[PDB]
Each structure stands twice: as structure tokens, then as C-alpha cells.
Design a protein around this nucleic acid. Structure first.
Lengths: 255, 351, 255, 254
DNA sequence: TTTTTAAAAA
DNA sequence: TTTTTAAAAAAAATTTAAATTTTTA
DNA sequence: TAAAAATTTAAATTT
């Protein structure tokens, strides 16, 4: 018996557009204290850690810690059935085979019920410990889309260098030799253009690019990407959703 | 091969079939049923009836097929090993004789297709006249030897050695079209190796661990289940098919409860129906020890592979040159580590 | 000599873009007091009934009841060679096999002369009259295009329930149960937004979705859709063009 | 040590997006007073003549008359990484065959260095200027892209007639028979949208249209086309880049 | 080696 | 009526050249 | 609001 009503509806559309092309079999860990999606790629390369808390939902009411598992292509089509201003009311029953989505119109002429059926689905949960990351950089998200897309044009691997002066995204391949230095802002105090390069140690890690393109498909969710990593841990591509939580992405480095 | 196993798994367990992408893995070492690929590029690759021949009057279609498939799957990051068929056992020779009589019937109807002048019947009846030979085995082994991509000669059929390769953990998957590796004990089985088009036949995995978890059965229970489905060693019970076998294994144990429960008038047991070593070679096959041999994805030899693949087999230089430069591009090192090495699994969720 | 100077040439551009993917060979039954088309080119009943009256054109001069066969995707390409603010002139000499299309740009710079090579083809129309449409809904074309475009993602069957409170575009299939309901809004001062329903008895008719998607791809002709249907009479998808006529589509229900 | 500080890097981006599909391998004849490119196409029926002079770059430096073989699809996919307002600074080495391109932002936050793998290919000059061009048509490039895109739907061969009152584009085929008489509009006080023409002899000649569609992809470079043609002499499709140089396009008529 | 599927069959 | 057996249907892959969606403003 | 641009499909060849 689960019912979550959102006073802005485009954020779940952005979450499903972020989570369509990456993973398809995801199980929604819905508790009384929030909505969680701890899920992982089918080839065990990338992890998705969505957290939507109770403070941003207009009417959040879930009694038991019920877990549902949808097809995220199907739920992405259902979230493509809603417009950008539709009031989205989630709706479910106890052990229900169907997930009901009520896309209420903001001007109240289109109340579109959507009974999307579930499936029997299990996803293993990998517990991320709370750890201090060395290269914690907070940097603009459309800029990250530009970096990931324009280096996925070049090759298949990005060798990120973190230092005191700035972060350095370097990609190599047969096409050429990309090397993008992204320095620290010293003049702009706006949060949507600030590129903070605060360190604990300099690191040098090599990640993939199709998975980083799938990661940076979460561009309209947030302006800032708290890109947190260290020398051995997979990086945290965190998109701070406005007063609901964070869509955290995890990708293991190549060795 | 098992008749209707994949339809039974798609009816029962949708959580064990994972339709993934071709490019999704990028470093998951798989094991190829090689002779299945030889036949899959011998029937399918033709000039509308004319197989890809040479100047010496010997075929080359399976070599170009494995070339194009292996470059298209290493370009997506998959590192294969091609486990070849060896000696089929004496218990398999009944269905081998049935395939030989099917080939004899197809060669009989090929003469009527030639005399009738039908241009499409002759193509469909030279489809069934295929033969993996020792010449074909040595030719495919020589092509994969000049690939730098390893091949493992099995002492039995290749499905059991692929299952032993996955069970030892030397590879991570058994990329094999038929479902014999699920009853030979491989936890991972991906099918439909079509790296060209994603929408045509996507890569579907077959988690045997998920099959043995949602059914609750163990390994030998799944072996006896595949026996009552019917395989290429032992015939099935007359009147018992896919829907009866899940009921006859799932609340049950083995062969002995069937032969002390099922009366021999409604569902009669076949005469000379051997299961005593059919179960035994399915659990314990004559395979290679995978800790002995080492998988070596070495650098390819260039110029003699170009001259053997082109001047002896009537091929353009630029296609084979593009294939070997794509292999040298695809083999740069930089092994992609998985997330299970870094984050520990703290359980799962139900639905 | 048939003559039709149309100053709002985007109307004919949108008519040909609507009928490009639906009808391939259509007869242009040109009358002395209007331009008519009645054709179908589908295995399902996909009758397209177009009216282009002579009152809304800038200059009409036809002295014969000629009807020419047109490979309609070629005329759709030639009408796609026109502009959105372009004056479109139609000429047809009696002894010629050409439908002469002349485009006059409004800055009087680009003057075109396209000749559409006609061919001889005869099809038999069926002639659906206005046979007492019990349930008619007037509603925005963007709303109907949105509803059909996202209900085609679920399945193929749309059932259309209607009452006094609103129209219900329920659809179910392989993915879920999508139930888009609407509300009659007579209080909206915007007349193109104001959903008005005239209903005699409630109706519930199963319809196809690819043919109805081809029907609702006639969107930017008119802001409103005069969608009308009866209990067993086929559906009418009407685009009342502004003082030009109507583009009526006919969809047989799936019993 | 070649170095070319270019402020408006969208000019070079629109050059390489105008030459990616027509040209697959090209040579950049870098002189000390500009850069040239006189390469052939893949089917060897057209010729692309490109010139960016050194008076449009911010700073420019050369030491030799170095020519480098550049895969233009590769440099087009590298020039897609720059923004529409990002500056572009080319860099070349004597010992190493790399074309380094750094893409600084208008602010000082993002520097995008981008090297290249240069091919090795022969150089030759087939310009042949002063061909006694009979008529010019100075029409807008969006209008010419509209002409090529609309006439491409009918057939693959176009004939172009020139007269004193305007220029006539017309083709034929099974799909129809089009004829666009683009008129004299020099009366417009905007010279940039005006069509100006001069005439010495009436011409009518059959050009190709697929390679004309390949030519007209330089419509974001300049918003005028200085097309000049003759009886048997191949035409130009000249794209006069603003205070930087010019890009021509030759096609021998069929 | 695979899937359908339309007749039969308990 | 679900099902089991039976007699059929079949086993790719690359470039090349339209077609159908997504984004850009 | 449209067209580049990424994407998908079908056809002849891959010998």
C-alpha cells in the first residue's frame, strides 16, 4: 500500500531518461523514509544508486518496506507518457502486480491513470560504505556531458587526472589524442558554474566511455556533479536532486 | 541439444534469461562452441545456393564467418575462446545416426530438387548437406592459431568442456547456442551470437544459478529434468514432455521415484532406456582440466596470416587488413574490472 | 484549365505531409466549387475524406470535373519543396499529363514551376454520410496527438469511453493499462483549449493505433479535433481548417 | 612550428563539417601567409579549393611550407569537440606528425588539447585561375541550400540557365519536372539577401546534383554564395568567409 | 542445432 | 483442452543507401 | 520549426 505524490513531475521523467539506456532490471527499494533504487548493470560494470527522500514528495505515504521491480524501458515509456509539468502520483497496493501512476494535469484537464504491470525480479544489493574520497570535484553537468560526449567521440577510455590546479580528462585512441584540462574557478561564485577541485591526493584512473555517456544522460536532473573518487574506489557521479536526494552513479576503473 | 528447454525456462523463469547487449560486457571472457559456429556460418553464408568456394575447390565460408564474428565481438570487447568438438561418445551415436539418416534423406531429396529444376529447393536442400571434417577442424584451428585467439581441443563434445571452463572460473561465460551447457553444469550460458544487428537476435544469458534457486532444484535434479525433456544421448519417455517434467521433478527427486511411481500403461517407459551413465557423464564429463592450459590472447601474426587468408582463399587485402588492425586496436590491454571486486554484496530484494 | 492560387500554402503542405505516410495513390476529385479527395491505400478501412473549398483560396478557376491520379508521396515531396509562408498555385492543362505546381515566395524572389507527372488510376469511393454522430468531442489537436503518440507505446487497442464528465482514452496491451481521462472545460477563455463534449449515449469502441497515429499526424492544420463516433459507425477524425474545409478521416472499429 | 590562433573557431568547424563527406583524405598546404587545400573528392569528379589567409587569424606563425595529410572525417570529429564560441589554436611539430589543437573557452575554465595522427599522401596543384567566367550569381547560401535540397528530390542531374532578369534552376526525372526561376532582387537595401547578377553570354549546362548537395553544406560558413560558371569551364561555388579567405567548389558539368 | 504449429491424444 | 508428438520451418555479416527517430536553437 | 545528426532497415555482395 504505497502512494507518493510529487509536486514537480519532470524529475522522475529525467530519472527514467537517465536510467533507460543503462539498466533495465531494477528493483525499487521503497521504504517509509524514502524511495531507493540500488541496482547494477547486467555486465557488472556500472551501478545506479537513486535516493528520493520524503521531504520533496508532496504526499509521501508508504507503510511497509515493500520492494517492486519494473522494466525500466517500460517505466521509461510510462514516464514518457507524462508531460513536463504533470503532477505525478505514484500508487500501489500490498503485493500488487500492477504499479499505478496518476499523471494529474497542473491545470486539471488530463488525469491519466497508468496501471503498469510488474514482473518477478530480483537484484542483488551491493553495500557502499561511507568513505572519504580524494578527488571530490563539483563541476557543471552540461559541461560534463560535453566532456563525456566529446571524448567518447575520440576513444573508449578516459584517463582522469586530478591535481591542485584543475582536473584533467584525457582520452586516447586511433582517432587522435584528446586532453581536456578543466581548471578551478577563481572568479565565478555561482554554484552552477563553479568547478571546485578540492583534493586529498592526486589520482590517475581510467574509466569507460559508453557507461560515462549513460551516466551523463542524467544531465537535466542537476546542475552540479559531485564527482567523488579516490585511487582505488569506483567514482561517484552524483547528481544532487533538488530537496529529494541524489542519483549516484558508480563505475569501476580499468586496470 | 534439448528440445524445448529454452521455451520451458522462458515459461517458468524470466529472471534467469537476461537479454543483454552485445557491447555490454567489454572484457567478459566467454567460451565458444566452435563447431556450432562452423555450421552457423556454413548454412547461412552462401551466394544463394553457391557456398563460398576457392580456386582450389574447397570452401572458405566458415573462415570468413568466424573472422567477421570474432572481429565484431572483440571490437565490442568480448574476449572469446573457441572450444572445438572432439570425440562424441558411444551413447550419443543413436542421435548421431538419426542425424546421418536425416542427411541421407536430404541427399535423397536433393536429387529430386536437382531434377525438378527448382532454384529455391536446391538451396534449402544443400543447406542440410554440411559436414564438420578434420580438414575443417584443422582449417578453423589454423585460422584461430593465426588470430592469436586461443582454442581448446576437447576430449569430448565442446559443450562439456565449455561448462568445465565456466565451472573452473577460467572464463566467465559459455557463449553457446544450444542448451547442453546448462545440463552440463555451466552457471552462465549466453546464446544467439549475432554481433552485427542488436535488434535481430540480442544476447540472452541463461543463469543456471537463478534456475536452481527459483525452482529449488539442485544440479542432478536439473540433469534428470533434462533427461525427461529428452536430449541427444538418452530418449525421453513416450507421453512425457515439457509441462509434465516440471511437475515430475519439482515436487520430486530423481529417476527412481518416477520408475516406482509412474505406471507403465499410461506413460510407458521405453525399452533399453539407459540413464545410469547418461546421468554420470552429465555430472562428470571427460573434459580438459582448465587449470593446466592457459588462455593466451596473444598478438596476431600479420603478414603470413594476410597471405594465407588472401592469396590462398581469394580475398581482398583491405578487408583482412581492416580486421587485423581492428584486432590490434581491440587488444590494448586495460582489463576492465567489475564492481564485485570493490563492493560486497549485502543481500538482495524479493520482488 | 484548372486554377487554384492558395495564399496559405502551409495548409496544403500539412495536408500532403499528413497524407504522405497514409495514402500512396489518391485521386484528386477536383470539383467546380471545391477540391475533394476520397481514397484509401491500406488493408484496414483508412478512408480519407478531404474538403478544400473554393471560398478560402485566393483565386480558383476550374471549368471541368476532372480527377487525376497522383502518386501521393511524390506530390508530398514536391509540396515539401515549398515554404511555410509560400504562395502555392496549382495548374492543370487539359491535354497535359502534368499537375503544374507554382510556388511564389512572399518576397517575390524565388518563383518555382514544378510539374507533377500524373498517371491513370481509378479507385471506387464508398461515400460515408453524416449518419447521426451520437458522441462528438471537440478538443485540442496537440492533446489528441500526445494521447495517441504515447498510447501507441503500450499497445494497439484504444477503447474510447465517454460520458458527460469527460472522454476516457483507455488502452491496454503487452506493457500496462493506460487510462487517459479528460474533463469537459467550458470555463476556459481560450477557445482552442476549451474541451466541449456533446453526448447522447455513452460509447466504448476498440480502435487500432498505427492507423490512428497516421490519422493524428494531421496535427498543425487546426488547433481542434472534431472527433465523432457512434455505436457501430466508423470513427471520424475531423480537422476543420480555418475557412478552408475539413480533413475527415475514417477508422473502422475493431468490433 | 606552425601556430594559428583563431578566435572564431566556428569558422574552421564549419569548414570541416562542410568537407567531411565530400573529402575523406586531404592535404593542408600551409604557406607562411595562409593555409590552402586543393584536394580531389573520393570519386575524383569535383575539386574543393579552400583558402584561409593569415589576416583573419589573431596570431599566425610559420617557418616552412609544410604540408600535412589530414583525414577530414577525423579532424571533423575532433572539431566537433569545440564549441561554437570556443577559440581554436592549431599546432604542428617538425619531427612529430601531430596536429595539436587546443580549444580555449571564452573564459579561462576549459582548455581542450587535441592532437592528431597525420596521414602521408601526395600533393598536387590543379587550381587554374582566370578562367574567364561569363556570369556570376551572388545569391544567399540558405537560398542556394534550399535550391539544392528542393531540386535533389526530383532527380540527380540539374541544368542551370542564366539570363539578365534572373537565374533558372531546373531538373527532370520520373518523380516530376521542376523549374525554379530565381529572380533579380538587387533592389533590396540588404545586400546580404540580395541576388546580384552580371551577364556576358547565355549559358545552359548540365551539372551533377549529388556533389552539388555535397557542395552546399558550407551554408553556415558564409551566408552568400558567389557561384560563377561558363559554357564548358567548370563552375565555382565560392563561399566568401568574412575577413578570413574563401572556399571554392569546382564541378565539371555532365 | 533451433523454433513453430497444426493436427491428434489422453 | 492443454499437451505431446510430428513435420515442417530455419541457422551471418559487411558496405551501401533511404528512412525514422532523437537533439540542436 | 526544421535540419543536421545519430540511428535503423533492406539489398547486393562478402566468393
Amino acid at each position: 500500500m504505497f502512494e507518493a505524490r510529487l509536486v514537480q513531475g519532470s524529475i522522475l521523467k529525467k530519472v527514467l531518461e537517465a536510467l533507460k539506456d543503462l539498466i533495465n532490471e531494477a528493483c525499487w527499494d521503497i521504504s517509509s523514509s524514502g524511495v531507493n533504487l540500488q541496482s547494477m548493470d547486467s555486465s557488472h560494470v556500472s551501478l545506479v544508486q537513486l535516493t528520493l527522500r520524503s521531504e520533496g514528495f508532496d504526499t509521501y505515504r508508504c507503510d511497509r518496506n515493500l520492494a517492486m521491480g519494473v522494466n525500466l524501458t517500460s517505466m521509461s515509456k510510462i514516464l514518457k507518457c507524462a508531460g513536463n509539468e504533470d503532477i505525478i502520483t505514484l500508487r500501489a497496493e500490498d503485493n500488487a502486480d500492477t504499479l499505478a501512476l496518476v499523471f494529474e494535469a497542473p491545470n486539471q484537464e488530463k488525469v491519466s491513470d497508468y496501471e503498469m504491470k510488474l514482473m518477478d525480479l530480483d537484484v542483488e544489493q551491493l553495500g557502499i560504505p561511507e568513505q572519504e574520497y580524494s578527488c571530490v570535484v563539483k563541476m557543471p553537468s552540461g559541461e560534463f556531458a560535453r566532456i563525456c560526449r566529446d571524448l567518447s567521440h575520440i576513444g573508449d577510455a578516459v584517463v582522469i587526472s586530478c591535481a591542485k590546479d584543475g582536473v584533467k580528462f584525457s582520452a586516447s585512441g586511433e582517432l587522435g589524442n584528446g586532453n581536456i584540462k578543466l581548471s578551478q574557478t577563481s572568479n565565478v561564485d555561482k554554484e552552477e558554474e563553479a568547478v571546485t577541485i578540492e583534493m586529498n591526493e592526486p589520482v590517475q584512473l581510467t574509466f569507460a566511455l559508453r557507461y560515462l555517456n549513460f551516466f551523463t544522460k542524467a544531465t537535466p536532473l542537476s546542475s552540479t556533479v559531485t564527482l567523488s573518487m579516490s585511487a582505488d574506489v569506483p567514482l561517484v557521479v552524483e547528481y544532487k536532486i533538488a530537496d529529494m536526494g541524489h542519483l549516484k552513479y558508480y563505475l569501476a576503473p580499468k586496470i | 541439444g534439448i528440445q524445448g528447454l529454452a521455451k520451458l525456462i522462458a515459461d517458468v523463469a524470466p529472471s534467469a534469461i537476461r537479454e543483454n547487449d552485445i557491447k555490454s560486457y567489454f572484457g567478459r571472457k566467454v567460451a565458444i562452441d566452435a563447431s556450432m559456429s562452423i555450421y552457423q556460418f556454413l548454412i547461412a553464408v552462401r551466394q544463394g545456393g553457391d557456398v563460398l568456394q576457392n580456386e582450389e575447390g574447397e570452401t572458405t565460408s566458415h573462415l570468413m564467418g568466424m573472422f567477421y564474428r570474432t572481429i565484431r565481438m572483440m571490437e565490442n570487447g568480448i574476449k572469446p575462446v573457441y572450444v572445438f568438438d572432439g570425440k562424441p561418445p558411444q551413447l550419443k551415436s543413436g542421435e548421431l545416426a538419426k542425424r546421418s539418416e536425416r542427411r541421407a534423406e536430404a541427399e535423397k531429396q536433393l536429387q529430386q530438387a536437382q531434377a525438378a529444376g527448382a532454384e529455391q529447393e536446391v538451396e534449402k536442400f544443400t543447406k542440410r548437406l554440411v559436414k564438420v571434417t578434420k580438414q575443417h577442424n584443422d582449417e578453423c584451428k589454423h585460422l584461430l592459431s593465426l588470430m592469436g585467439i586461443p582454442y581448446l581441443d576437447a576430449p569430448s563434445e565442446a559443450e562439456a568442456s565449455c561448462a568445465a571452463l565456466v565451472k573452473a572460473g577460467k572464463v566467465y561465460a559459455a557463449a553457446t547456442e544450444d542448451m547442453d551447457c546448462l545440463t552440463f553444469g555451466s552457471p552462465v550460458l549466453m546464446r544467439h551470437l549475432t554481433a552485427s544487428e542488436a535488434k535481430k537476435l540480442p544476447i540472452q544469458e541463461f543463469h543456471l544459478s537463478r534456475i536452481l534457486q527459483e525452482l529449488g532444484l539442485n544440479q542432478e535434479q536439473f540433469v534428470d529434468l533434462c533427461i525427461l525433456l529428452g536430449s541427444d544421448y538418452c530418449e525421453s519417455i513416450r507421453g512425457i514432455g515439457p509441462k509434465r517434467a516440471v511437475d515430475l521433478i519439482q515436487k520430486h527427486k530423481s529417476i527412481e521415484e518416477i520408475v516406482r511411481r509412474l505406471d507403465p500403461n499410461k506413460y510407458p517407459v521405453p525399452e533399453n532406456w539407459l540413464h545410469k551413465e547418461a546421468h554420470q557423464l552429465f555430472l562428470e564429463p571427460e573434459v580438459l582440466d582448465p587449470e593446466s592450459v592457459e588462455l593466451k590472447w596473444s598478438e596476431p601474426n600479420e603478414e603470413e596470416l594476410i597471405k594465407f587468408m588472401c592469396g590462398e582463399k581469394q580475398f581482398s587485402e583491405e578487408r583482412i587488413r581492416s580486421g587485423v588492425k581492428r584486432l590490434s586496436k581491440s587488444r590494448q590491454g586495460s582489463t576492465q574490472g567489475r564492481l564485485d571486486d570493490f563492493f560486497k554484496v549485502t543481500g538482495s530484494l524479493s520482488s
